[PDB]
Amino acid sequence: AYDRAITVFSPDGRLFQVEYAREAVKKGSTALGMKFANGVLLISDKKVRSRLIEQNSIEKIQLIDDYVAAVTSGLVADARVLVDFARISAQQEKVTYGSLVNIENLVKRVADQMQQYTQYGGVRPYGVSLIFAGIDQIGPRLFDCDPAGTINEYKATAIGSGKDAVVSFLEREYKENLPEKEAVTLGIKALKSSLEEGEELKAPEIASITVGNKYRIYDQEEVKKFL
Template sequence: MQQGQMAYDRAITVFSPDGRLFQVEYAREAVKKGSTALGIKFKDGVLLLSEKKVRSRLVEKNSMEKIQLVDDNVATVTSGLVADARVLIDFARVGAQQEKVTYGSLTNIENLVKKVADQMQQYTQFGGVRPYGVSIIFAGTDTIGPRLFDCDPAGTINEYKSVAIGAGKDAVTDYIEKEYRDDMALEDAVKLGIAALKSAVADSESMKEPEIASIKVGETFHIYTIEEVQKYLS
């Protein structure tokens, strides 16, 4: 820890002289220790992938779900503190239902992402709380088409063609920047995503059964079975 930093990282509401909020930066560090996950837009839909770290062979694999449905047309994948992710996903599910009751359908995913981002941003403004230690990728389809967003612990959101989070973010991003094409079909996107994950994940055990989900325009989210995933891995 740098000299003088201690005075500015005790509370979330205190800026350092160079304009930094250390607690937010620490939350981002927590995300960097999480599982690697990514989203990819293809020609007529969106794809989500995540490595699956099993800490012990005594853990039931079915209890570890990185990809979570918010709605039939919206799903998330997270990296960071699992408990924080669960709370925010529940918040997003309520927001999605409120949007449906108000407008009849989830017409714009960006509105939902902004609600979650606003919730995360509030926890960077008040004393006695800490930021959420999680980043979330939102993917789905709406009246605009396929959408892919990333939301970080500061509540910052951006829309992407492809985005990665977690421990292998930089390696995955470098790989996809070289290989990505706007006109990719679903099959090509899955192969690209798996190859990108493999380039970033050192532990081969966590890549034996990665989680994969996809959605095409006019359809609902499909979460791949173990058999479907193995077909691509082989």
């Protein structure tokens, strides 16, 4: 009765279509971010299918600009559209003021676009969660954003199928101000804890950035050293 249309409140005040969109996100691959000493990092898993697939066109961590990266989970095509929105929206701010002072405003514009898709008939929500990570004038930043357009700022966090496991691990194991190498190590352990019976984890994507610098994407061979 109350869960067929985005514009319909249930008697308890719930928006069921938006809750169902959050189920699409639970099915995506696991990714996490965490702040460390003068920096922030992102790590993405992903199930590669065939050996006939091209790796490198592999598309999980997406730069928004030199100082800001995102990872997503949920419907992939929805996620690409929101990533294009974020990139163009960051450039509009940069052209207007000459720079992006506070990453939080970028995340809000994206979240506002996703909120609108929970308020107008004729449209479905984006079935996507994002993590944004980078440096602005405040310092290293880490945010998540969900299908409702709800945002939180984090010291560490995760999205996708293994979210709960990863969040639990970091809940017990996370410490602030780790050197980058320790952060990546902890991240990899948190990601591994989320796997079943016997999986071991193939090479994930890793990206980091520290104050005064631009993003670096660890390449295949750098990541191997952590496995």
